[PDB]
Design a protein around this nucleic acid. Sequence first.
DNA 1: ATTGTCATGGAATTTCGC
DNA 2: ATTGTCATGGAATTTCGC
DNA 3: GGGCTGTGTTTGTATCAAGTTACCTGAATGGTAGGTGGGGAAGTCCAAATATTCCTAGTAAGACAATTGCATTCAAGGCCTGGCTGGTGAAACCTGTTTCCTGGGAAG
DNA 4: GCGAAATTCCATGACACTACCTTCCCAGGAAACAGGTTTCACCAGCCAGGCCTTGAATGCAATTGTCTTACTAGGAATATTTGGACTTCCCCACCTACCATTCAGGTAACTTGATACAAACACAGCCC
Lengths: 83, 94, 94, 110, 99
Amino acid sequence: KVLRDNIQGITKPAIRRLARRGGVKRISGLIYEETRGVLKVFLENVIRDAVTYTEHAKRKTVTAMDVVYALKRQGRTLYGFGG
Amino acid sequence: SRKESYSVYVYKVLKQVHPDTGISSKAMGIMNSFVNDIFERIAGEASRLAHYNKRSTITSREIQTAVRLLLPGELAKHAVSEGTKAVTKYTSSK
Amino acid sequence: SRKESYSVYVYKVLKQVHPDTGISSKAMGIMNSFVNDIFERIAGEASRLAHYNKRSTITSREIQTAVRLLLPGELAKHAVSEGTKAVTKYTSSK
Amino acid sequence: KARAKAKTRSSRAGLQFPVGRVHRLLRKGNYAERVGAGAPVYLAAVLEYLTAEILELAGNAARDNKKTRIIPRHLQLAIRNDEELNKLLGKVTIAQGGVLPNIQAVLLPK
Amino acid sequence: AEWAKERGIHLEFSTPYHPQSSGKVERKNSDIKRLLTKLLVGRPTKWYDLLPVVQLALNNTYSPVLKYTPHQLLFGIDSNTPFANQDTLDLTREEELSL
DNA sequence: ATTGTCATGGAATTTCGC
DNA sequence: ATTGTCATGGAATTTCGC
DNA sequence: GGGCTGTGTTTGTATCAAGTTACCTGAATGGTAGGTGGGGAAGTCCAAATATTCCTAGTAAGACAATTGCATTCAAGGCCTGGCTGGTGAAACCTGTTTCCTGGGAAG
DNA sequence: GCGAAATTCCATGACACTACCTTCCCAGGAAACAGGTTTCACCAGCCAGGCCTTGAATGCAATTGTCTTACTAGGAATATTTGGACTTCCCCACCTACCATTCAGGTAACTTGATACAAACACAGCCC
Ligand SMILES: [Mg+2]
């Protein structure tokens, strides 16, 4: 199923609100075309590593431990969902 | 079927230093998955300590070195001495 | 005693694509230790693929997934197809 | 016939984390072929010191913000408050936590 | 079976654990593995190349106790094969159907 | 509501030569 | 410088009764 | 002097968890016999660390020169904030379907 | 001589090292999920005005970069001296493999219990 224009779903306040959690007061208007780029790099290195686990067990559902196993691979461990 | 866990053994530690304290479901899974991760760091460094010294044997010496590597500074002083109590108490028994 | 190595099997690859080329001693050890490290990444991810799917068996399918994880992008397209040639050639023999 | 009283090995060492369950997770995880009888004892202690040290610190932050139960925000905040606990989990995201309160003291208003 | 009822296929199954019931296919599988065995002596078994050979080499082996090709008993005359009969070319095809 | 088979080489058999 | 076998139930066989 | 947003205190119930248990099986223990792995004691040989000097190279330093870095002022652009509108996201409801999900089972 | 009973006969099949592997079935349930409807409230998108921050231009001051010299210590080669890692050989205790027995935990259920959230009115802290 194909639904495009959804890198533009990461809206303009929801990058500002993520900026405020990092402790950032004033931002530019050109981070919005940088953040959407660095985000899709990070999801093209997790979903590419997650699907090769789900294809390997011949599952059609990328389950909760799969993503945690992908994040185990990169060296960014996620607790709380298992694994 | 059966999912093994460390959830029961948290209430036997939570009710040791904070006996009037509950703990939520979604916070159990963190202390559940804290254990399984900090398990296989210590095991998976004691494992690779077996190959580095050409032995097929995980002793209780090799778990001690694989805790002085993963834990930094002041945790590496306590969690060593909080294990050698539980071994010397164990071996004097049985 | 005996130190096993991959040093001999480099000259059988160095003299395939650059037949007029030598290689130094201290550069052999890099391509020696490149192999032993890239060995146990692929094995040590195929190993942990055995536990994740509850099998005691390293197949030649599990090495293929543990190369599509470690190698990025365009190496993951060739080193898969540079293995399935060497298996189909292998199994049609014997 | 009957047999003696089955005394668990977690009660024979004064721990709370099991040693029977740890000793079959060193022979079904392919860590090595032989696993000593004292190794899952010694490992269930180190799993028990570090389970206290978070929950000791997670008890305080629950108390300092007037809470009975420990929600993951406290686990988020018990970690990264202690220095040496943070250097263990320096790479590790805790789910549903947010960050510590922090301003770089240059963004303060004028 | 739901595809087989479309064609008019009457499916027939053997009695279980009885491979002797399926008669000819257990024989020709001892033919295919004696043709593809003989071609592939001393080379890697690249037998996907040699499958158009087999249903043209076995289908023109004379049954040595019937003395006919599989082609003749199926069609009636040989196709352009090496060593094909001219003994039927002295006849009319409009009448050798009932022959 | 199903069931061997059939290529294959001694060896026996038939043709038949004159 | 080696080679079937042997328990087992119809079924045929023998005993034998008088 | 006033105002706004964050903050606190109190109540009720829903939800989440705490509770106790019933069983039942899974697993956890007890007692043993066996072999193997490892641990321990030894030795010739091995690799590193030291005591030395010697010489040399670059390290250390003193002087000088010029650029850069800094601090200020100038100019305006860019961004933050807010008064507003609406389109979607989410929460609650219903389900059929699809996939799994080990697990058992048949058959070639 | 027929029948009943006691006996010998002989044609035959299975034992040879065995489990996996594949694909379809079954199945119950459940897993949610993918699908879809529904509604309300909220978060995002819109646009502009004011101000503050950044960028630039600059002059200058010291910081820094280069040049030069006396020199200290690093490195290498040496002899030697010394400190040990690993190879070696052997034995014992410890781990394992096993079954039987039993206990404990996980699921599960019914109940209970307790806390957190949502709401409302007010208080306090900080800022314009
Ligand atoms: Mg078949």
